Amino acid sequence: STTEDLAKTFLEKFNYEAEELSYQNSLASWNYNTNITDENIQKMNIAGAKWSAFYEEESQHAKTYPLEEIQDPIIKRQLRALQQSGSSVLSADKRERLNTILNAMSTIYSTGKACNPNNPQECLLLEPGLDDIMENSKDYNERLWAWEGWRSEVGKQLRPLYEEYVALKNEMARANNYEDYGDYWRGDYEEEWADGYNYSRNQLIEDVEHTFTQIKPLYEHLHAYVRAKLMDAYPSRISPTGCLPAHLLGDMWGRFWTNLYPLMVPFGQKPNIDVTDAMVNQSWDARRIFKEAEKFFVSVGLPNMTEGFWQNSMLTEPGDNRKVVCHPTAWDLGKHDFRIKMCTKVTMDDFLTAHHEMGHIQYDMAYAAQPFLLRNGANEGFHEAVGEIMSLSAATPNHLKNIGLLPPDFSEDSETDINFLLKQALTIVGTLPFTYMLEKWRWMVFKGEIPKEQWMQKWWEMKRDIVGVVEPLPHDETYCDPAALFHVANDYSFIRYYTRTIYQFQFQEALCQIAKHEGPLYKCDISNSREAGQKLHEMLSLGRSKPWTFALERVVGAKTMDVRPLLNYFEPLFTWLKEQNRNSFVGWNTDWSPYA
Amino acid sequence: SKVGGNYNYLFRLFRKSNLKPFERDISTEIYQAGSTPCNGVEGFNCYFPLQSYGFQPTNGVGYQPYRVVVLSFELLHAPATVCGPKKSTNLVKNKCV
């Protein structure tokens, strides 16, 4: 007897019992971060430990289940994700050493504090103070002490720890039949078994360079933009021929950048859009804005939401003895039981986030009709893009006025667009250098062309050509300023922001043109598109069965992401990148050093 | 559905083959799945189908119960006391009726 029936009944049985477990697990995460009680913590320690038991067992059991005698191809990806040989091929000694290393760093990470110079009593948990001073003001030595210390305590204690972790990860996923730990990470984007649209583990090396060298003429001048957008800052401590110090990252790896811009500003007299006094005068509430969003989505044809959604969803801050943090998120409990959480307070960003979660309600009701082990979108790239399409369209004055924040007597101008583009210029343009740095450094080391001891040094000719940061205190293996942040303190990768950036304008243009709209891709809105609404709702019904080119050719007709929109959709920005720099130095030389 | 966990009631999900119209199936036996024999126990390519509700008040609309009653009026030949209620009226005398 063939094993196709065996494995499909096996995956269905996993669906049943592991869906009991994962249903109570989604409800348990929900409870855990809404109730903090010791028995519930003991449930997290013990009952939550029952979660990890069964998946490994059938991961080992389905490992014995074979791949040869299967028609109905579906099971092939199932076992590759349910045999999950991966790390289990190697020795429990290796995996146990790395895991107990992770437990050690987790404990010491949970226990961490660093604080003020000369006054170790008004101490500073990295939450409320001098770090916020670094961003709201321009306090140089302040961000020094913060970031120096927040590695000097954490990073030094785990430097041999983290280094052994990384090198032995290299060893394991060299032995993984993959190339290294990061190709083990790379195992996400592989697709095959449909003719013509294969993706390999070596072709992706070159093409993204080409799209990045389709970034590079923009990028090297985008490079020449932040380089130039930092000119008016400091004449005496930064020579125009010099490398800029390390403590201008914005973060502990430069994850956000908008710091020196409002000092560099050419035109900053006009205040931003602030309507908080009007909210105080009128006193709207999230309940009113909730049906506001509901009827806006009705204007594009979207229905209401059921009872079990919100009879557990608490929409207000609890306070009292029930301590709950105010980070809003979108949740799902499964089996026709879906639930959401937010904190309520009058804010335009809170309204936009509520729209984010309702657009997500429809947009991930998209894949609620698939079998349990496959409930996703065509690939994982459309996700962070189709998530924020409508919210970013609402960032334009049109929908923000349709929600009634502004009076009708306001006339339309193109100066609004020019300074909105300018504002995005001094706000958002910071992350892509580091993003693609980690992406391309990842692909080379994952194939093996950049070492670990000269990580900083090779990342200096680079970064003097990426975003301009270099140590004034050079780092050897003792001193310490990468790991002051939790994200890359836990070793992830950086392709998703590139995917979002180039994909979102492609979706807007394709929706515009199937809806028969024309214009620039900053002005390419998807509102009032019912005839493409059953397309936009079909843009959200794909599955995970086909290679990405089939899904593209169906939803939009263009099989690939387009970077001619990168070189000619920036044609105005790439020029405003030049126009703002037409009377400024295009370049800022890179040879002087602070410590000589 | 009861609150404290409805592990009393049970579900059934599997059988071997197709079935004729109009019969009751109460099969709870081990299913032989692969080439290896089962001998009536879970093991090498073997499976026991039965599971319980375990209902908490949280389960969703599709998995919330919908009592379906199939009123199967099977038509055969009887006087069939059960046909339907009959009404009546009041009578008037000494008139052409």
XYZ file of C-alpha atoms in Angstrom:
693
model
C 0.000 0.000 0.000
C 1.216 3.486 -0.882
C 2.048 5.941 1.881
C 0.124 8.905 0.437
C -3.089 7.910 2.222
C -1.074 7.099 5.343
C 0.637 10.492 5.395
C -2.500 12.492 4.605
C -4.407 10.750 7.399
C -1.309 11.364 9.529
C -1.305 15.101 8.800
C -5.061 15.237 9.421
C -4.624 13.471 12.770
C -1.896 15.957 13.636
C -4.414 18.624 12.659
C -6.911 17.147 15.138
C -4.820 16.567 18.269
C -2.220 19.272 17.617
C -5.161 21.588 16.915
C -6.595 20.825 20.316
C -3.121 21.685 21.608
C -2.600 24.726 19.357
C -6.124 26.010 19.990
C -5.500 25.961 23.721
C -2.004 27.297 22.931
C -3.289 30.361 21.086
C -5.811 30.828 23.892
C -2.937 30.261 26.330
C -0.705 32.933 24.815
C -3.785 35.178 24.854
C -4.363 34.439 28.555
C -0.654 34.564 29.461
C -0.272 38.111 28.256
C -3.655 39.111 29.713
C -3.459 37.297 33.074
C -0.293 37.074 35.170
C -0.871 34.467 37.874
C 1.561 31.965 39.350
C -0.530 28.899 38.482
C -0.872 30.303 34.961
C 2.888 30.843 35.038
C 3.223 27.271 36.311
C 1.008 26.483 33.335
C 3.535 28.334 31.176
C 6.341 26.387 32.867
C 4.608 22.999 32.881
C 1.366 23.009 30.861
C 3.037 25.195 28.246
C 5.855 22.648 28.160
C 3.325 20.072 26.955
C 3.246 22.019 23.673
C 6.766 21.150 22.525
C 6.399 17.431 23.256
C 4.232 16.059 20.457
C 5.587 17.978 17.455
C 9.085 16.524 17.854
C 7.687 13.010 18.329
C 5.892 12.935 14.984
C 8.761 14.958 13.554
C 10.755 11.856 14.460
C 7.873 9.534 13.532
C 7.176 11.168 10.163
C 10.936 10.974 9.617
C 10.440 7.219 9.309
C 7.460 7.911 7.019
C 8.826 7.838 3.448
C 8.786 10.110 0.368
C 9.053 7.679 -2.550
C 5.615 6.095 -3.047
C 3.517 9.295 -2.968
C 1.256 10.531 -5.712
C -0.747 13.675 -4.864
C 2.468 15.734 -4.490
C 1.298 17.752 -1.452
C 3.007 15.501 1.115
C 6.476 16.231 -0.298
C 6.681 19.668 1.329
C 4.840 18.256 4.349
C 7.598 15.825 5.337
C 10.353 18.299 4.444
C 8.665 20.443 7.097
C 7.503 17.497 9.231
C 10.379 15.059 9.036
C 12.382 18.176 9.946
C 15.718 16.375 9.836
C 17.554 19.696 9.750
C 19.228 19.973 13.144
C 18.242 16.470 14.328
C 20.733 14.750 11.998
C 23.610 15.976 14.169
C 24.335 15.219 17.786
C 22.297 16.057 20.853
C 25.616 17.071 22.423
C 26.019 19.924 19.934
C 22.368 20.935 20.144
C 22.405 20.740 23.948
C 25.465 22.904 24.276
C 23.944 25.609 22.075
C 20.568 25.326 23.817
C 21.981 25.664 27.338
C 23.917 28.653 26.003
C 20.576 30.098 24.899
C 19.084 29.459 28.348
C 22.034 31.225 29.981
C 21.718 34.301 27.770
C 17.945 34.305 28.293
C 18.325 34.435 32.076
C 21.046 37.100 32.102
C 19.056 39.066 29.509
C 15.992 38.959 31.757
C 18.229 40.349 34.524
C 19.793 43.559 33.155
C 20.390 47.167 34.263
C 22.831 49.991 33.448
C 22.659 53.601 34.566
C 23.868 57.120 35.099
C 27.458 58.391 35.262
C 28.617 59.741 38.640
C 25.087 59.148 40.005
C 24.281 55.392 40.280
C 20.927 55.989 41.957
C 18.670 57.612 39.333
C 19.284 54.516 37.288
C 18.081 54.069 33.764
C 16.521 50.809 32.583
C 17.021 51.860 28.908
C 13.300 52.698 28.974
C 12.521 56.283 30.062
C 15.527 58.559 29.717
C 18.886 59.336 28.134
C 18.001 57.020 25.228
C 14.905 59.124 24.501
C 17.198 62.132 24.887
C 19.404 60.666 22.143
C 16.470 60.804 19.692
C 14.407 63.838 20.796
C 17.593 65.871 21.381
C 21.115 65.436 20.034
C 23.054 64.357 23.117
C 26.276 62.814 21.863
C 28.127 61.650 24.991
C 24.738 60.602 26.361
C 24.062 58.023 23.654
C 27.720 57.123 24.102
C 27.289 56.034 27.729
C 23.976 54.302 26.969
C 25.119 52.149 24.051
C 28.652 51.506 25.328
C 27.237 50.245 28.630
C 24.337 48.256 27.200
C 26.818 46.097 25.472
C 29.673 46.344 28.031
C 27.552 44.477 30.566
C 25.585 42.141 28.274
C 27.938 41.630 25.359
C 31.164 40.925 27.250
C 29.571 38.288 29.485
C 28.400 36.323 26.425
C 31.157 37.161 23.917
C 32.817 33.700 24.059
C 29.272 32.399 24.527
C 27.932 34.117 21.393
C 31.074 33.447 19.335
C 31.007 29.721 20.111
C 27.288 29.759 19.293
C 27.886 31.327 15.865
C 30.906 29.229 14.862
C 29.244 25.980 15.882
C 26.104 27.041 14.004
C 28.396 27.354 10.984
C 29.536 23.789 11.640
C 26.052 22.302 12.072
C 24.462 23.806 9.001
C 27.553 23.051 7.004
C 26.716 19.466 7.964
C 22.995 20.128 7.283
C 23.472 19.438 3.523
C 23.089 23.224 3.345
C 26.012 25.621 3.226
C 25.908 27.200 6.700
C 23.565 28.394 9.446
C 22.180 31.058 7.181
C 21.432 28.737 4.304
C 19.630 26.664 6.920
C 17.783 29.956 7.361
C 17.528 30.304 3.545
C 15.471 27.114 3.278
C 12.288 29.226 3.152
C 12.094 30.376 -0.488
C 12.616 27.061 -2.316
C 9.828 26.095 -4.739
C 9.532 23.464 -7.477
C 7.342 20.716 -9.051
C 5.685 23.172 -11.476
C 7.338 23.652 -14.849
C 9.360 26.744 -15.677
C 9.496 28.559 -12.331
C 12.209 26.863 -10.267
C 14.241 28.758 -7.676
C 17.629 27.419 -6.617
C 20.011 27.927 -3.695
C 22.739 29.480 -5.876
C 20.924 31.606 -8.482
C 19.544 33.949 -5.812
C 23.141 35.068 -5.212
C 23.424 37.130 -8.384
C 19.966 38.472 -9.231
C 19.497 40.477 -6.029
C 22.872 42.102 -6.676
C 21.441 43.055 -10.065
C 18.327 44.493 -8.446
C 20.690 46.059 -5.906
C 22.846 47.339 -8.751
C 19.461 48.479 -9.951
C 19.409 50.011 -6.488
C 23.095 51.014 -6.609
C 22.887 54.008 -9.006
C 20.056 55.106 -6.765
C 21.766 53.591 -3.729
C 25.263 54.995 -4.248
C 23.477 58.328 -4.552
C 21.069 57.323 -1.794
C 24.391 56.693 -0.083
C 25.378 60.154 -1.345
C 22.136 61.427 0.201
C 22.441 60.602 3.913
C 26.147 61.346 3.483
C 25.068 64.778 2.228
C 22.046 64.976 4.541
C 24.453 65.118 7.485
C 26.522 68.087 6.296
C 25.131 70.983 8.338
C 25.632 69.183 11.662
C 29.135 69.591 13.159
C 32.033 71.460 11.506
C 34.706 71.067 14.212
C 34.358 67.417 15.278
C 33.528 65.971 11.829
C 35.848 66.943 9.003
C 34.136 67.009 5.578
C 36.817 64.547 4.437
C 36.278 62.246 7.423
C 34.460 59.108 8.507
C 31.493 59.678 10.778
C 31.605 58.228 14.316
C 29.894 55.023 15.379
C 27.496 56.583 17.897
C 25.201 58.045 15.227
C 23.526 54.692 14.512
C 20.108 55.710 15.787
C 19.941 52.275 17.365
C 22.241 49.486 18.508
C 22.563 48.533 14.841
C 21.021 51.581 13.176
C 17.521 50.127 12.932
C 16.112 53.670 12.641
C 17.876 56.822 11.553
C 15.902 60.084 11.709
C 18.239 61.987 14.060
C 20.302 64.775 12.410
C 17.682 65.532 9.754
C 15.643 68.315 11.460
C 18.937 70.063 12.184
C 19.957 69.702 8.523
C 16.488 71.015 7.513
C 16.272 73.582 4.675
C 12.597 74.417 5.333
C 11.050 73.473 8.675
C 8.905 76.431 9.744
C 5.561 74.745 9.010
C 4.395 72.415 11.812
C 3.269 68.861 11.149
C -0.360 67.727 10.963
C -1.555 68.095 14.563
C -5.277 67.873 15.326
C -5.000 66.880 18.992
C -6.669 70.101 20.154
C -9.599 69.295 17.865
C -9.838 65.808 19.354
C -9.867 67.379 22.827
C -12.639 69.741 21.710
C -14.805 67.023 20.115
C -13.730 63.941 22.154
C -14.250 61.096 19.689
C -13.661 57.521 20.844
C -12.363 54.219 19.475
C -15.951 52.890 19.445
C -17.023 55.672 17.059
C -13.890 55.222 14.947
C -14.599 51.472 14.987
C -17.854 51.832 13.079
C -16.090 54.535 11.056
C -13.643 51.883 9.848
C -16.511 49.417 9.433
C -18.439 51.693 7.085
C -15.270 52.737 5.243
C -14.666 49.053 4.502
C -18.342 48.866 3.550
C -17.536 51.581 1.005
C -15.240 48.948 -0.531
C -17.758 46.269 0.428
C -16.703 44.484 3.616
C -18.950 42.864 6.249
C -19.165 42.939 10.030
C -17.640 40.622 12.634
C -19.152 37.952 14.851
C -19.874 37.750 18.591
C -17.034 35.483 19.738
C -14.569 38.003 18.321
C -15.047 40.639 21.018
C -16.698 38.955 24.029
C -13.155 37.983 25.062
C -11.352 40.792 23.207
C -10.828 43.497 25.834
C -10.533 46.873 24.099
C -9.719 49.015 27.154
C -6.808 49.234 29.568
C -7.557 47.011 32.598
C -5.389 48.700 35.224
C -5.999 47.654 38.842
C -4.509 44.257 39.765
C -4.687 42.899 36.194
C -1.463 44.207 34.642
C -1.451 44.209 30.827
C 0.976 45.945 28.479
C -0.400 48.269 25.787
C 1.172 46.832 22.634
C -1.683 46.272 20.138
C -1.563 43.111 18.017
C -3.788 41.009 15.754
C -4.576 37.536 17.093
C -6.250 34.301 15.976
C -7.450 31.361 18.059
C -8.547 29.128 15.178
C -11.598 26.956 14.493
C -13.975 29.841 13.675
C -12.904 31.545 16.940
C -10.899 34.685 16.129
C -9.949 37.377 18.646
C -8.049 40.682 18.724
C -6.418 42.995 21.300
C -5.679 46.727 21.503
C -5.342 49.555 24.026
C -7.761 52.450 23.527
C -6.660 56.092 23.402
C -7.445 58.921 20.975
C -4.621 58.960 18.420
C -4.461 59.162 14.633
C -1.800 56.442 14.773
C -4.127 54.335 16.924
C -6.887 54.825 14.337
C -4.486 53.830 11.557
C -3.415 50.777 13.574
C -7.058 49.794 14.077
C -7.495 50.044 10.310
C -4.305 47.991 10.002
C -5.892 45.206 12.049
C -9.236 45.310 10.194
C -7.551 45.312 6.799
C -5.665 42.383 8.294
C -8.994 40.873 9.374
C -10.070 40.551 5.752
C -6.515 40.056 4.489
C -5.801 37.004 6.657
C -9.333 35.742 6.537
C -7.843 35.342 3.074
C -6.244 32.018 4.067
C -8.665 30.664 6.676
C -10.250 28.214 4.196
C -7.107 26.109 3.665
C -6.385 22.820 5.462
C -4.866 23.470 8.863
C -1.233 22.694 8.036
C -1.257 24.951 4.932
C -3.213 28.100 5.929
C -1.020 30.793 4.370
C -0.707 33.084 1.377
C 0.879 32.132 -1.942
C 4.328 32.989 -0.609
C 5.509 34.945 2.425
C 6.547 38.045 0.466
C 3.167 39.674 -0.198
C 2.494 39.774 3.527
C 4.303 42.877 4.804
C 3.033 44.980 1.895
C -0.576 43.974 1.363
C -0.775 44.482 5.121
C -0.047 48.214 4.927
C -1.265 49.136 1.409
C -4.565 50.613 2.600
C -3.085 52.224 5.721
C -0.413 53.999 3.675
C -3.117 55.051 1.219
C -4.937 56.478 4.253
C -1.755 58.369 5.165
C -2.530 60.535 2.137
C -5.028 63.360 2.821
C -7.873 61.621 0.953
C -8.983 58.952 3.432
C -7.801 60.953 6.454
C -10.320 63.582 5.353
C -12.948 60.971 4.469
C -12.827 59.897 8.128
C -13.704 63.522 8.865
C -10.557 64.892 10.525
C -10.479 67.892 8.179
C -13.082 70.407 6.951
C -14.214 70.449 3.302
C -12.995 74.016 2.668
C -9.396 72.764 2.238
C -8.176 73.146 -1.349
C -5.806 70.708 -3.043
C -2.199 71.597 -3.886
C 0.914 69.833 -5.142
C 3.003 71.551 -2.461
C 1.382 69.144 -0.010
C 2.818 66.272 -2.049
C 6.226 67.941 -2.386
C 6.603 68.376 1.377
C 5.119 64.941 2.081
C 7.827 63.459 -0.138
C 10.318 65.689 1.669
C 9.006 64.430 5.030
C 9.377 60.800 3.994
C 12.879 61.845 2.932
C 13.847 63.098 6.382
C 11.971 60.220 8.070
C 12.195 56.790 6.479
C 15.236 56.618 4.187
C 17.563 55.338 6.913
C 17.142 51.580 7.254
C 17.800 50.213 3.747
C 21.648 50.495 3.972
C 21.884 48.237 7.035
C 19.011 46.093 5.737
C 20.753 45.127 2.522
C 24.089 44.972 4.348
C 22.837 42.164 6.546
C 21.114 40.631 3.515
C 24.201 40.581 1.313
C 26.683 39.793 4.078
C 24.296 36.963 4.926
C 24.319 35.566 1.393
C 28.119 35.724 1.057
C 28.934 34.192 4.480
C 26.134 31.675 3.911
C 28.227 30.792 0.877
C 31.417 31.690 2.783
C 33.230 34.846 1.634
C 33.511 37.076 4.749
C 35.010 36.080 8.110
C 34.011 36.714 11.711
C 37.068 38.224 13.416
C 37.390 40.916 10.721
C 33.611 41.361 10.707
C 34.033 44.929 11.966
C 37.033 45.699 9.744
C 35.523 44.469 6.474
C 32.347 46.216 7.623
C 34.289 49.506 7.661
C 35.224 49.976 3.999
C 31.715 48.684 3.490
C 29.954 50.979 5.947
C 31.962 54.010 4.867
C 30.264 53.026 1.602
C 26.891 52.029 3.203
C 25.640 54.658 5.663
C 28.824 56.277 6.986
C 29.377 54.904 10.521
C 32.797 53.849 11.886
C 34.117 53.275 15.402
C 35.852 56.207 17.072
C 36.788 53.512 19.587
C 37.680 50.570 17.311
C 36.297 47.227 18.448
C 38.574 44.265 18.954
C 37.164 41.057 20.415
C 36.849 42.661 23.869
C 34.977 45.934 23.494
C 31.469 45.775 22.574
C 28.760 47.605 20.616
C 26.784 45.326 18.294
C 24.525 43.402 20.652
C 22.908 46.209 22.644
C 19.547 45.222 21.070
C 17.453 42.082 21.392
C 16.703 41.481 17.683
C 20.185 40.728 16.314
C 21.081 39.717 19.843
C 18.914 36.808 18.627
C 20.329 36.435 15.104
C 17.727 37.046 12.384
C 17.837 38.197 8.747
C 16.743 41.223 6.720
C 15.030 40.578 3.337
C 11.476 41.538 4.285
C 11.896 45.320 4.188
C 13.299 45.216 0.651
C 10.429 42.931 -0.327
C 7.906 45.363 1.170
C 9.496 48.434 -0.405
C 9.610 47.221 -3.983
C 6.473 45.052 -3.827
C 4.038 47.634 -2.435
C 4.317 50.059 -5.356
C 4.031 47.135 -7.762
C 0.746 46.106 -6.135
C -0.536 49.679 -6.211
C 0.365 50.137 -9.896
C -1.114 46.781 -10.910
C -4.337 47.451 -8.994
C -4.477 50.905 -10.597
C -4.024 49.529 -14.120
C -6.415 46.575 -13.826
C -8.778 49.183 -12.372
C -7.573 51.334 -15.310
C -5.848 54.116 -13.390
C -2.809 56.111 -14.523
C -0.279 58.267 -12.703
C 2.743 58.203 -10.399
C 3.175 55.369 -7.926
C 3.098 57.708 -4.922
C -0.387 58.807 -6.051
C -1.695 55.374 -7.051
C -4.573 54.674 -4.658
C -6.774 51.577 -4.361
C -9.908 53.247 -2.962
C -13.312 52.857 -4.656
C -12.210 49.778 -6.618
C -15.178 47.414 -6.338
C -14.756 45.972 -9.840
C -11.263 45.067 -8.662
C -12.612 44.526 -5.147
C -13.582 40.976 -6.041
C -10.075 40.913 -7.494
C -8.522 42.478 -4.390
C -10.443 39.954 -2.302
C -9.224 37.347 -4.802
C -5.723 38.813 -4.508
C -6.257 37.376 -1.009
C -7.409 33.787 -1.662
C -4.331 32.009 -3.002
C -2.996 29.181 -0.827
C 0.540 27.718 -0.890
C 0.395 25.350 -3.871
C 2.009 27.184 -6.802
C 5.333 28.886 -7.532
C 5.244 32.655 -7.193
C 5.172 33.368 -10.942
C 1.828 31.597 -11.387
C 0.328 33.600 -8.521
C 1.710 36.843 -9.962
C 0.464 36.088 -13.487
C -2.980 35.376 -12.041
C -3.406 38.248 -9.572
C -1.751 41.015 -11.602
C -0.420 39.584 -14.889
C 3.214 40.567 -14.240
C 5.165 37.473 -13.221
C 8.056 39.267 -11.482
C 8.760 42.225 -9.239
C 9.698 45.236 -11.353
C 12.713 47.453 -10.620
C 12.233 49.773 -13.557
C 9.677 51.211 -11.104
C 12.654 51.483 -8.741
C 14.779 53.474 -11.198
C 11.887 55.486 -12.682
C 9.445 55.598 -9.758
C 12.286 57.296 -7.907
C 12.738 59.287 -11.133
C 10.978 62.017 -9.302
C 12.392 61.023 -5.829
C 15.822 60.079 -7.203
C 15.676 63.568 -8.703
C 14.336 65.193 -5.530
C 17.208 63.243 -4.019
C 19.198 65.304 -6.540
C 17.039 68.461 -6.529
C 17.398 68.878 -2.765
C 21.110 68.200 -3.324
C 21.443 70.322 -6.493
C 22.616 73.288 -4.383
C 24.358 71.097 -1.782
C 27.528 69.024 -1.802
C 26.870 65.760 -3.649
C 29.414 63.765 -1.676
C 31.276 64.010 1.595
C 34.816 62.704 1.639
C 35.835 59.708 3.671
C 39.485 59.624 4.814
C 39.863 61.531 8.106
C 39.485 59.606 11.376
C 38.687 60.899 14.882
C 41.391 59.107 16.898
C 44.006 59.039 14.092
C -21.622 22.511 25.112
C -20.720 22.612 28.815
C -18.242 24.901 30.529
C -15.781 22.806 32.525
C -14.679 20.797 29.497
C -17.111 18.532 27.657
C -14.933 15.424 27.656
C -18.158 13.429 28.100
C -19.494 13.506 24.534
C -17.422 12.113 21.671
C -16.787 12.587 17.950
C -16.250 10.045 15.178
C -14.230 10.891 12.082
C -13.220 7.793 10.091
C -14.348 4.545 8.442
C -13.039 2.088 5.859
C -15.238 2.367 2.757
C -18.453 3.818 1.352
C -21.838 2.841 2.796
C -25.333 2.072 1.546
C -28.260 4.452 2.081
C -30.181 4.370 5.370
C -28.197 2.373 7.925
C -26.532 3.026 11.287
C -22.741 2.751 11.598
C -21.076 2.345 15.001
C -17.652 1.144 13.850
C -14.881 1.823 16.391
C -12.288 -0.716 15.246
C -8.650 -0.234 14.249
C -8.146 0.625 10.588
C -5.488 -1.231 8.581
C -3.565 1.476 6.770
C -0.433 0.134 5.080
C 1.224 -3.089 3.989
C 2.071 -4.049 7.573
C -0.758 -5.868 9.388
C -2.569 -4.254 12.298
C -3.780 -7.244 14.378
C -6.425 -4.877 15.769
C -4.114 -2.461 17.615
C -2.458 0.869 16.877
C 1.073 0.421 15.588
C 2.734 -0.062 12.200
C 0.296 1.734 9.873
C -2.634 1.473 12.295
C -5.155 3.894 13.773
C -7.967 4.181 16.319
C -10.557 6.748 15.185
C -12.471 7.749 18.325
C -12.072 11.112 20.077
C -14.128 13.128 22.541
C -15.678 16.587 22.367
C -13.629 18.266 25.085
C -15.846 21.283 24.469
C -15.047 24.518 26.239
C -17.382 27.489 25.660
C -14.786 28.908 23.254
C -15.317 26.721 20.171
C -16.378 28.558 17.043
C -19.528 28.843 14.969
C -18.713 26.087 12.483
C -17.869 23.695 15.325
C -20.799 24.854 17.442
C -23.558 22.228 17.308
C -26.401 22.304 14.802
C -28.967 19.633 15.666
C -30.118 18.251 12.312
C -33.304 16.169 12.397
C -34.048 14.265 9.186
C -37.813 13.750 9.283
C -37.710 10.757 6.939
C -41.300 10.227 5.824
C -40.822 6.809 4.234
C -43.931 6.287 2.111
C -45.473 2.825 2.365
C -48.976 1.330 2.584
C -50.840 1.838 5.861
C -54.014 3.638 6.957
C -51.377 5.621 8.850
C -53.168 7.044 11.890
C -50.462 9.734 11.738
C -51.632 11.801 8.735
C -52.738 15.201 10.057
C -55.263 16.968 12.278
C -58.793 17.547 10.994
C -60.925 20.580 11.817
C -64.682 21.108 12.134
C -67.309 23.846 12.228
C -70.698 24.622 13.724
C -73.962 23.339 12.253
C -77.133 25.269 11.393
C -80.529 23.575 11.202
C -83.675 24.107 9.119
C -81.827 25.504 6.097
C -80.786 24.374 2.623
C -77.292 23.121 3.435
